[PDB]
Ligand SMILES: N[C@@H](CCCC[NH3+])C(=O)O
Ligand SMILES: N[C@@H](CCCC[NH3+])C(=O)O
Ligand SMILES: [Mg+2]
Ligand SMILES: [Mg+2]
Ligand SMILES: [Mg+2]
């Protein structure tokens with residue numbers, strides 16, 4: 176009971192300071208039509224931190240409704256640094272038809288490994304849908320160790336793998352060498368192919384917001400062990416993959432989506448804001464080397 | 471600028487049966503007042519700000535204000551958020567409910583740029599007319615307020631008067647006060663309270679003072695009075711407890727020590743925080759034995 180394949184950490188478009196729900200649905204339809212296997216509403220890339228709890232819930236509902244009647248799954252963002260709120264989001268996602276949840280390691284409060292284990296156990300015990308852990312220490316200030324990930328995978332029936340955003344291919348080897356049944360998911364676009372070629376089973380991508388067909392193809396080639404073709408795409412995408420992090424994600428990806436005419440306004444919620452003019456121009460220049468699908 | 475400086479405590483938040491123990495909270499604050507503390511910080515990191523509800527966060531600020539009323543002790547209310555709209559809401563609440571100023575941690579998790587940090591804190595500072603202390607703790611937030619950004623905020627915004635630094639970076643503390651000597655640099659790292667004060671820092675926002683308020687207030691007051699020999703003496707004596715209070719993530723050790731000292735009833739955290747390991751529980755207990763812990 177897993178959610179794998181090519182997946183997108185959806186941006187959240189704003190219009191006049193509110194979630195633009197029509198644009199959100201339209202962007203999801205564009206992901207579906209370009210080979211994406213699942214969408215992740217309200218992850219880091221979707222500005223989870225600055226949505227209200229009601230908006231967070233609305234974006235999950237829009238993703239569920241938009242994916243009905245399709246093969247595309249909804250892996251709902253449900254993380255929180257307070258376990259009671261992470262349980263509440265997990266339950267909401269279950270009750271409102273998500274296929275599974277993503278759940279980021281608690282940020283700012285730096286729980287111990289024992290606390291992370293208890294956090295995730297509480298979340299997994301609250302629902303009967305798949306739970307994907309999400310490790311991104313550069314943002315949270317903590318790491319879910321390999322031992323803790325493996326213990327959670329083995330001890331909790333619905334915890335099925337981890338999204339790694341840690342720049343640590345050693346850890347990816349460690350994870351799958353000791354627990355080959357888990358689903359390791361790339362959370363770092365530039366190294367999608369290395370993670371997949373070591374037996375990772377999907378990506379939760381920032382770049383796919385802009386280039387969903389390319390990330391889709393990369394992932395599906397790799398899962399088929401067509402590594403030459405997957406690597407070729409990974410290699411081709413390196414420049415855009417890296418420029419999308421020239422400032423904190425999702426500042427560059429929303430900039431690119433705006434430059435591509437895919438969102439109406441380059442609008443963030445504070446404390447996120449527009450990139451520098453110089454970075455804005457760098458992103459624009461890198462984009463010229465890629466074919467960007469429209470609607 | 472109006473300022474809040476001196477010896478300050480990042481209050482722990484005691485829980486009882488899963489709720490804030492409001493009587494214990496007030497009792498702990500009165501104990502801080504009686505041991506020379508200059509201000510208290512309700513609902514900082516040490517107060518488990520992340521896992522209190524917005525209502526509990528507000529109640530703890532109100533208890534601090536009421537308990538300090540009529541004493542000279544100030545309330546520098548924890549008001550940070552990684553969402554600017556919520557940081558503004560907490561700032562306004564603290565202003566409207568009688569806090570003397572606010573602490574406001576740099577946004578965690580979403581990694582704003584320096585421009586975003588500037589706009590975040592400008593919005594906060596413009597929303598109130600009480601002092602605002604920035605708070606940099608990159609190991610927990612994932613971002614750093616640069617020296618340049620702190621100094622610009624200090625110069626551009628009337629209310630922003632300094633920063634609590636929890637960054638292990640005495641070079642930055644020199645940089646800050648060499649280029650902007652008018653700001654109030656506040657130590658947010660107990661083990662290096664004395665180095666920060668001796669370079670012209672003007673107070674501490676302390677974890678250790680929860681347990682040893684008299685020692686931390688004395689350390690700070692000796693230093694402000696330029697008795698560096700005596701401030702260093704206490705800083706040195708406190709190193710072992712200062713370090714053991716971070717053997718696991720703060721506030722796990724300090725709540726453990728407060729419980730071991732009989733100062734709180736229950737060793738209760740909100741998940742994802744939890745009890746320390748049995749080894750670290752014993753280590754904290756052992757280190758505490760070398761210090762004289764004031765009662766109530
Ligand atoms: N700003 C808070 C609340 C987010 C609520 C919706 N995801 C946080 O980052 O945890
Ligand atoms: N857990 C959320 C909400 C805290 C609300 C009370 N301080 C955060 O850390 O931002
Ligand atoms: Mg809205
Ligand atoms: Mg999440
Ligand atoms: Mg790490």
Ligand SMILES: [Mg+2]
Nearest residue numbers: 341342343363
């Ligand atoms: Mg890397």
Ligand SMILES: [Mg+2]
Nearest residue numbers: 395396398399
């Ligand atoms: Mg095939």
Ligand SMILES: [Mg+2]
Nearest residue numbers: 400401402403
């Ligand atoms: Mg091949």
Ligand SMILES: [Mg+2]
Nearest residue numbers: 549550574575
């Ligand atoms: Mg704060």
